[PDB]
Ligand binder design. Structure first.
Ligand code: GDP
Ligand code: MG
Length: 199
């Protein structure tokens, strides 16, 4: 079965673009009009069987402050997103994490810095520290290129199932890349996180 996943972060960070990479989850999405949400059934296939993350994507109301309690309620996991080309989105991560945990106190949470395909990166590995204090997991991602798409969900699945050896045995069908994520740049970004991490 299944887990409610809430996807939060400033307007314009690429939450909608992200959740939409998973093609069947977009085709089978369900409206929850009473809370201004579209729930996308993101199925992933593990060595322990199938897991379904029901990802709750807003209809843009985060542009105007915290979300309603009904949005967060009964969430079993979360992704907090920021835009690595917009420093204020990173600065707002504490506010999202507070908005989130007030309603969902013991859930696994991953932090994702999106748009790493844009050449002029502002929030670099050296400054990404918020996950460390809260012992949350961080990934760089690029929704438009599918780069690291599966990472946040694999880390959440390991935490929810309590199996640090879980693996995905097949990739979901994803929208074809709309930008190129340069493999050398990606490698260097992962390296920089590793090097920031040993500090
Ligand atoms: N370059 C780049 N642009 C992105 C990416 N994800 C989203 N965008 C752009 O960011 C803008 C806001 O994306 P949206 O998904 O609507 O963000 P939301 O408001 O957080 O749901 C749109 O112009 C997107 O096309 C990405 O990975 N790379
Ligand atoms: Mg959106």
């Amino acid at each position: 079965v299944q887990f409610k996943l809430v996807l939060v972060g400033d307007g314009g960070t690429g939450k909608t673009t992200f959740v939409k990479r998973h093609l069947t989850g977009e085709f089978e999405k369900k409206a929850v009009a009473t809370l201004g949400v579209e729930v996308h059934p993101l199925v992933f296939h593990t060595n322990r069987g199938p897991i379904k993350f029901n990802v709750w994507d807003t209809a843009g109301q985060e542009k105007f402050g915290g979300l309603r309690d009904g949005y967060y309620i009964q969430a079993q996991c979360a992704i907090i997103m920021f835009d690595v080309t917009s420093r204020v989105t990173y600065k707002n991560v504490p506010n999202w994490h507070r908005d989130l945990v007030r309603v969902c106190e013991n859930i696994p949470i991953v932090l994702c810095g999106n748009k790493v395909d844009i050449k002029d990166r502002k929030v670099k590995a050296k400054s990404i520290v918020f996950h460390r204090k809260k012992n949350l997991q961080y990934y760089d991602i690029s929704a438009k290129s599918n780069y690291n798409f599966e990472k946040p969900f694999l880390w959440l699945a390991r935490k929810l199932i309590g199996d640090p050896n879980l693996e995905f045995v097949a990739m979901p069908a994803l929208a074809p890349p709309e930008v190129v994520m340069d493999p050398a740049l990606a490698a260097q970004y992962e390296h920089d996180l590793e090097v920031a991490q040993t500090t």
